[PDB]
Every structure is written in structure tokens, then in C-alpha cells.
Amino acid sequence: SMEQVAMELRLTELTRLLRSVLDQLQDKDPARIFAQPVSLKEVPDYLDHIKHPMDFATMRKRLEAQGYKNLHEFEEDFDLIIDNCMKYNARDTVFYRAAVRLRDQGGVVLRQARREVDSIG
Numbered sequence: 001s002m003e004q005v006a007m008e009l010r011l012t013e014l015t016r017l018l019r020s021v022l023d024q025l026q027d028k029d030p031a032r033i034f035a036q037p038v039s040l041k042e043v044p045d046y047l048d049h050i051k052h053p054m055d056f057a058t059m060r061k062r063l064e065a066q067g068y069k070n071l072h073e074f075e076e077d078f079d080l081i082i083d084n085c086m087k088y089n090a091r092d093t094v095f096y097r098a099a100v101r102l103r104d105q106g107g108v109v110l111r112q113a114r115r116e117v118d119s120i121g
């Protein structure tokens with residue numbers, strides 16, 4: 001149907017917008033602390049603490065599979081990256097502090113993304 005194609009075009013475009021957001025958010029992590037899953041080889045007990053791990057590579061995988069249906073689902077995953085890190089790591093660590101900075105600097109990007117999604121539809 002022509003309708004299904006139109007939906008696919010929108011989802012493709014949402015994916016295009018979300019890819020730009022993802023790139024902008026990952027740019028705020030030059031230390032690449034959040035680039036990859038927390039290694040279960042280095043942190044064997046990680047899953048005893050964190051029940052839903054997340055990272056930018058995992059987000060990117062879901063993104064290119066067009067697995068984000070709206071901005072809210074994308075934001076939930078971003079929030080997981082930050083919130084997991086701020087629970088697993090203590091307040092006076094490079095890890096916790098990086099998450100705080102990512103959350104603060106990411107808010108600006110996400111603020112405009114929300115306006116743009118509504119605006120463009």
C-alpha cells in the first residue's frame with residue numbers, strides 16, 4: 001500500500017534525525033566511557049547490579065535496525081546509560097562524573113530534538 005510506504009519514509013526520516021542526535025550526544029563523550037557495553041570480562045558482577053545495561057554502540061545497532069519508533073524510546077535508552085553509571089559507580093569517580101556531564105550537555109541536544117520531532121511531525 002502507498003500508506004505503508006509513507007510510514008516507512010517517516011520512520012526512515014525519524015531514524016535520520018535520531019542518528020544526528022546520537023552523533024551529537026556521543027560527541028559529548030570524548031573519553032568514550034559510554035561507547036561500548038560495560039565488559040562482563042572486566043566487571044563479571046555487573047549484571048548483579050545493573051539489570052538493563054545500555055551503551056552507544058547498542059543504541060546505534062537498534063537505530064540502524066530502525067528499532068526506535070519515537071523519540072521517547074530513544075531517550076529511555078540514553079537515560080539508561082546515565083542512570084546505570086550513576087548507580088554502579090560512586091559519586092567521586094571519573095565514571096559518575098562523566099555521566100553527570102553527559103546528562104547536562106545532552107539536555108540541550110534533546111531539548112531541541114523534541115521540538116523538531118513535533119514540528120516536522
Ligand SMILES: CNC(=O)c1cc2cccnc2s1
Pocket residue numbers: 033034038042043085088089095
Ligand atoms: C560506563 N562505564 C562503567 O560504568 C564502568 C567501566 C569499568 C571498567 C572497569 C572496571 N569498572 C568499570 S565501571
